[PDB]
Ligand binder design. Structure first.
Ligand SMILES: [Zn+2]
Ligand SMILES: [Zn+2]
Ligand SMILES: [Zn+2]
Ligand SMILES: [Zn+2]
Length: 168
């Protein structure tokens, strides 16, 4: 099962996003946005290795047309560090919830999405901080499990979530 990391299906213009470079063509490099369920972007040729993960900035989006244009050249080192850090934290949240889904034997992507919606994305929304919100709340749950009390979870879901958070 896959699912994106964050409530939104697309990044906002000016976001720095973690991508995997998939191929190189005349107009630029095609990449998969790792935080957004591997949707495709392009690093414009003017803004520029297959298989490498890189932090790039979102330059233009057109959801109707289907395009995401990106830039490597415009990412500052300080910006790359934050993106690597956000990505690791969010990926950890992802792995936790994916493990929760395995324990509960989810077979459908919507079950995993529903888990995110009722947990990580509640915290991301509560604190208006995508990625970090969920991560910080899950980490806090290690010492203060009550932070999960308000979530719309059944007893088993909660128990399995706490277990998987603890495993980390
Ligand atoms: Zn929104
Ligand atoms: Zn969106
Ligand atoms: Zn595993
Ligand atoms: Zn607390």
């Amino acid at each position: 099962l896959s699912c994106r990391f964050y409530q939104h299906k697309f990044p906002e213009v000016e976001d720095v996003v973690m991508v995997n470079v998939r191929s190189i063509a005349e107009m630029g490099a095609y990449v998969s946005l790792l935080e957004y369920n591997n949707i495709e972007g392009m690093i414009l040729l003017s803004e520029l290795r297959i298989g490498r993960n890189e932090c790039v900035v979102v330059i233009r989006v057109d959801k109707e047309k289907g395009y995401i244009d990106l830039s490597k050249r415009r990412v500052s080192p300080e910006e790359a560090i934050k993106c690597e850090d956000k990505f690791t934290k969010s990926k950890t949240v992802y792995s936790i919830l994916r493990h929760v889904a395995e324990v509960l034997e989810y077979t459908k992507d919507e079950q995993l999405e529903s888990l995110f919606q009722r947990t990580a994305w509640v915290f991301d929304d509560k604190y208006k901080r995508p990625g970090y919100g969920a991560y910080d709340a899950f980490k806090h749950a290690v010492s203060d499990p009550s932070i999960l009390d308000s979530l719309d979870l059944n007893e088993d879901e909660r128990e399995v979530l706490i277990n998987n958070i603890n495993r980390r």
